[PDB]
Design a protein around this nucleic acid. Structure first.
Lengths: 472, 291, 485
RNA sequence: AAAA
RNA sequence: AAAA
């Protein structure tokens, strides 16, 4: 009791301090007042302060705080932040005052880092749980001050020293922060950009493509950073990269293995990691044909900025916008008739109406695949029904490419309205982003076997199937 | 009288003039019947806050089952089953229930489930009983008294669109078709009469403006008045020895319709069963044969 | 009994509680009994002594003066009907609430240790009370039960937490031990007030076939959409207020549904058939505002057919530009649900769909109902399926009028379905159809609405399209008229 | 047409 | 047509 409290005052034993803390929490104020000054353990100091919150006048006079606000700390539910030492805690208690007074109770002495209250836009009382040296706990308190939604942030820890002018100094852990505008948006946004890159080749090229893609994402979300993303969710560059060393083999099992190992579960895992907040996917790919599979695994249920690759200058140009004011559904608009076609021209040739097999040939890139795909379908698949989609008058990267995909889907469904096609065989030379958008739109519904073409290799080869993307 | 909470409710029970008796017809699980009765209880309490199902079983002993024309599961598509259901439950229901509350009159609240069954119940209900026929509205799950129960010219028709065809003025068989819901019966009923009953004389009753939407926030009595006038109009010009009735109408409308033409017309009533093989129509009962 | 009380001060509590329950005590020791009301660690004894003193009107003036409670309120407490709240203990104990009319806010709590006036309880509850108890409880986690009994306009639900003068609620320790329906995941005064005094309980129901993580994501999105209109709603709050878990509200299966009609019918019977009935049974006294989204379009027509036109439902369609649901079908409130079944639209009055009716075999009473409001065209495949398999040449083809594949998620989708139903029943005008065959590429919410409107009253066999299947990819998974059987 |  |  009182003797135990006096013994704990004159000793450094942790068991007595914990017992005193438990007794105070579950409910001799002179020893409690004395323990407030003798801040041997910050956890004991904070608990004693709340017991006094419900010598209140003396504490208010000495600490530069009010009286009603001081007694309002007992009736305030603290906000908890985590910062490394183990993982110590910062407790924020509500305080109302005119002058900004961010009273922080520390083991050394109670100090008022007034800049903290101004930055956090709320006067607060700061308590701790352990004797922590340094000022590395600034970031956790500031982050828990700038939060808007009411939820426990124990999943995220922060570390750093916040200087008065609004910058953080270095001491899941978040310690790569440098500006307060970064921290405010990393907790008070609802759409977290997830930049995903599909590259096959050297690791260094993937690295600098990821850097350029981070820059392009920052062009719209200036608060984003790969280091910050890894800090806040553990989503590393490898967690966002559809990678693999060397040239992918022409064997069909290789592409299916690549899709099932990485592409199949990547989006669902990443969206699980960013659990409460929505995701604005940013996608760039390398191999054109693979995207049709990737897009099929990506689906139409994701808001995506699809960006084109530029080899000359390593900069990304967004060509597909599927986010904003109901802009997503526009990719599935199939209302464009043949007469009002402004971008592509479609030729639907049918020579064997009794055969429900169609060769979907698309030429919106550089090399013309019509001859090769026609020979392949007439020699290795026995197909005489073709749907050739090409350009009218190669594609301006600056302009939006949504009409291309809209009219491609419209032509495909117009073909499907008047005939039954058991199998569709996709042979295309199209830009990577357009192939990805086509895979998103057409999806795993229509039976489509996509064949990839390699000029360095039996030039064509059935690489995957749209309907089987939900299986492999 | 044991489950009385407020003295105000007790005062009205012993010193009222009319007692409301909510009657509901249902076929299916008894658990959903309990839900239907509870929704019916609220509508009565708007006009009689003192009314309660628990109190109804104390002063008189009327039980939720006693107020319910109830049968487990889907009613079998046999004419004998329908005639048994009307005879065993419906026919003696209203006469017996009135005798329970003998000193004071009865204001009947009614809401059914099977539209075709209401013609038999409405005919057997009688036109001497004051009735507040309800019709559930589903956006709010609430009941509305659409009926608070002739000689109207065709030119002065407000909401119905009557039509009479006499293609073979030799036989005295008439197909009475009433289309007020949203599932068109004219195609099926016309084909049923021609292929099975050999009938080509038809009287069609159809909504004039809003097919399937008659505002359940007003009085539906003018709807019923137009039907009686159109029906009686054909009888003066042509003598019908037997009229065959097919209707896609609201449940409340059919119950009031049976009251107007109860037992005084030679009307054949045909039910449509969704889970039945062709033919899906069957003469479940004849309106002039329940007496 | 004075001797029993003295023995308790120095089994005994049960004797006096039974003795005072029958009012067998005398007024000579009543003042001593008053001392018991101030010298009893069990709040039940103190509350019983207070009630006995109020009934006998003995020495109550001193207590009224010391507690700042009007004598009229103390007298009324004798004949007041105490509301009961339930809160877990270190079992589930009860809180007793008595009405009071004191001018000053006095929410007196008769605790075992000492009597304390939690005045802020009266402010939040908008009524002065005389809190009673039945056993000694350490920690004042009894706040939420009293607050819930105060905010009513009730033994099914129990509460646990601590309130603050701001109105916020904080839970206590031993939450896991206490949780071994118990409401402990609530934080706001508005949340409890609305959860207690609402008229319709939102019931977010989703149909999903896949993995549990994406099901959790979908349910979180649906919860956000519901909270947009009912800010007090929460899946945790629904779970501890009625026992309705996320599994109950989910028509869930693992992986791709097998492409067998037996599998689809088993899924409908085991989960879909009675789900709405049981959920409506759980929230018995209140109405239900079903918020519905689904995954497989064909399964919806059956889900809506079992759902029926007798339920007020907000059918939501997800807009993937912002990954937000939109209430595309509003069938509750001021918006009449009778307009769901409005078949008054003529063909010349169509503004959203384009409908045609081909009758090449008038002698046969069968036709193919093909709906194309999505993007992937089913007309060719379904027509080939009818002509090659079902031997059918009569068709009712419905597509979009102007913008095929894009139906504005911001606007109301009711006119689409109204015109579709009007076209169907105009086809049923001069023709008798023994069987109707339904092949659709239509939005999920539109499919559910069409199933609700058409119902089980038509001979409709619905043929699902399976992407990962061998030809024929159409198969009659169910029939609309056979769902009641 | 089995609360339209 | 497997949140269109």
């Amino acid at each position: 009791f009182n003797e135990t409290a006096d013994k704990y005052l004159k000793s450094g034993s942790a068991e007595a301090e914990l017992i005193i803390l438990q007794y105070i929490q579950q409910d001799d104020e002179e020893w409690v007042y004395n323990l407030l000054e003798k801040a041997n353990n910050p956890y004991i100091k904070l608990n004693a302060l709340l017991w006094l919150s419900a010598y209140l006048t003396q504490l208010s006079k000495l600490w530069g705080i009010s009286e009603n606000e001081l007694k309002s700390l007992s009736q305030q539910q603290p906000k908890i932040g985590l910062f490394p030492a183990f993982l110590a805690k910062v407790f924020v208690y509500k305080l109302k005052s005119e002058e900004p007074i961010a009273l922080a109770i520390l083991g050394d002495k109670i100090e008022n880092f007034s800049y903290l209250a101004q930055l956090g836009k709320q006067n607060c009382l700061i308590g701790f749980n352990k004797n922590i040296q340094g000022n590395s706990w600034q970031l956790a308190v500031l982050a828990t001050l700038l939060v808007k939604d009411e939820k426990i942030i124990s999943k995220i820890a922060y570390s750093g020293i916040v200087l008065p002018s609004g910058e953080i100094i270095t001491a899941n852990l978040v310690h790569r922060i440098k500006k307060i505008e970064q921290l405010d948006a990393w907790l008070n946004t609802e759409t977290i950009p997830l930049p995903v890159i599909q590259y096959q080749g050297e690791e260094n090229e993937l690295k600098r493509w990821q850097k350029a893609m981070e820059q392009k994402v920052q062009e719209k979300f200036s608060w984003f950073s790969y280091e910050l993303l890894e800090d806040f969710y553990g989503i590393t560059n490898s967690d966002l990269a559809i990678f693999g060393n060397g040239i992918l083999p022409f064997e069909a099992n290789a592409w299916q293995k690549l899709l099932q190992e990485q592409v199949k579960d990547k989006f669902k895992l990443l969206e699980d990691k960013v659990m409460p907040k929505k995701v604005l996917w940013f996608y760039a790919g390398q191999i054109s044909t693979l995207q049709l599979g990737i897009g099929a695994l990506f689906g139409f249920k994701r808001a995506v900025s699809i960006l084109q690759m530029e080899f000359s200058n390593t900069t990304y140009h967004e060509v597909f916008i599927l986010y904003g004011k109901e802009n997503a559904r526009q990719l599935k608009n199939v209302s464009v008739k043949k007469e009002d076609y402004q971008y592509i021209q479609s030729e639907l040739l049918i020579n064997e109406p009794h055969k429900n097999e169609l060769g979907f040939i698309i030429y919106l890139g550089s090399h013309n695949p019509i001859g090769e795909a026609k020979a392949y379908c007439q020699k290795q698949l026995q197909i005489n029904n073709f749907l050739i989609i090409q350009a009218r008058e190669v594609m301006e990267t600056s302009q939006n490419w949504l009409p291309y995909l809209q009219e491609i889907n419209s032509a495909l469904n117009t073909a499907r309205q008047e005939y039954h096609w058991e199998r569709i065989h996709l042979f295309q030379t199209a830009p990577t982003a357009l192939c990805m958008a086509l895979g998103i739109a057409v999806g795993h519904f229509l039976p489509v076997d996509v064949y990839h073409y390699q000029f360095n290799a039996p030039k064509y080869r059935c690489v995957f199937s749209l309907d089987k993307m939900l299986n492999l | 009288v044991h489950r009385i909470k407020k003295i105000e409710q007790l005062d009205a029970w012993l010193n009222t003039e009319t007692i409301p008796l909510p009657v509901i017809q249902y076929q299916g699980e008894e658990n959903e019947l309990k839900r239907w009765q509870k929704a019916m209880e609220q509508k009565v309490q708007e006009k009689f806050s003192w009314f309660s199902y628990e109190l109804l079983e104390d002063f008189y002993g009327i039980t939720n089952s006693d107020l319910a024309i109830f049968g487990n599961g889907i009613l079998p598509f046999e004419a004998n089953a329908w005639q048994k259901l009307l005879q065993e439950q419906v026919k003696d229901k209203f006469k017996l229930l009135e005798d329970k509350v003998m000193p004071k009159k009865v204001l009947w609240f009614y809401a059914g489930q099977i539209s075709t069954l209401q013609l038999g119940i409405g005919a057997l209900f009688g036109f001497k009983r004051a009735v507040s026929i309800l019709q559930m509205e589903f956006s709010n799950t609430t009941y509305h008294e659409v009926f608070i129960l002739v000689s109207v010219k065709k030119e002065d028709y407000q909401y119905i669109q009557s039509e009479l065809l006499i293609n073979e003025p030799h036989k005295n068989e008439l197909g009475f078709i009433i289309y007020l819901g949203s599932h068109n019966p004219i195609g099926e009923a016309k084909a049923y009469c021609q292929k099975q009953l050999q009938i080509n004389n038809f009287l069609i009753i159809q909504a004039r403006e809003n097919q399937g939407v008659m505002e359940t926030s007003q009085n539906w009595l003018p709807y019923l008045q137009e039907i009686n006038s159109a029906l009686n109009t054909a009888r003066q010009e042509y003598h019908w020895e037997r009229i065959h009735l097919f209707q896609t109408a609201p449940t409340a409308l059919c119950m009031a319709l049976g009251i107007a033409v109860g037992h005084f017309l030679p009307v054949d009533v045909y039910h449509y069963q969704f889970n039945a093989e062709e033919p899906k129509y069957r003469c479940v009962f004849s309106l002039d044969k329940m007496l």
